[PDB]
Write a protein that binds this ligand. Sequence first.
Ligand SMILES: Nc1nc2c(ncn2[C@@H]2O[C@H](COP(=O)(O)OP(=O)(O)O)[C@@H](O)[C@H]2O)c(=O)[nH]1
Ligand SMILES: [Mg+2]
Length: 167
Amino acid sequence: TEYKLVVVGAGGVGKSALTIQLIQNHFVDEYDPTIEDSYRKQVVIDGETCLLDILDTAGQEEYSAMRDQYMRTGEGFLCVFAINNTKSFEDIHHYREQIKRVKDSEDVPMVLVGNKCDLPSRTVDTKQAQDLARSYGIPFIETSAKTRQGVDDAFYTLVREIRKHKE
Ligand SMILES: Nc1nc2c(ncn2[C@@H]2O[C@H](COP(=O)(O)OP(=O)(O)O)[C@@H](O)[C@H]2O)c(=O)[nH]1
Ligand SMILES: [Mg+2]
């Protein structure tokens, strides 16, 4: 089965770098922040094959209805912030609200991702992010697209969350 995964978060948090590690096994140092693209990858998770369709978002669309549409078709959401950027963490509150609002749903599969854990000047404590995820009933995973810490776990965990919702 094909699953639609959507990677959301503020500009610069590492959405593209996380996605390209999973898809292409390398860490990109410069990927235009304004490009939005999708990637397909066949995988096996918990013994069951599936086709991932991963949308690496980049923010505003020509029409806001198009952003609403990809949230409606999206089955699970990787909500990414950067651990050195408090505003990107605060934005998670808005992503949670907006995705639920567009889907008109109280139960939306999501994983909270705190990326850039290899960088200095952390401003978001592990506990603060874990507590937020727990308040939503979703997993929290610390990642680094540079070292590949957590990357594969984040995406595979999101598929598990999608299946738990559908099952
Ligand atoms: N050190 C480090 N750099 C990262 C990490 N993730 C992304 N970057 C870099 O941070 C910048 C923004 O990443 P990008 O994936 O383009 O962010 P996006 O705007 O969310 O798609 C780029 O220079 C990436 O190489 C990370 O986990 N660690
Ligand atoms: Mg990007």
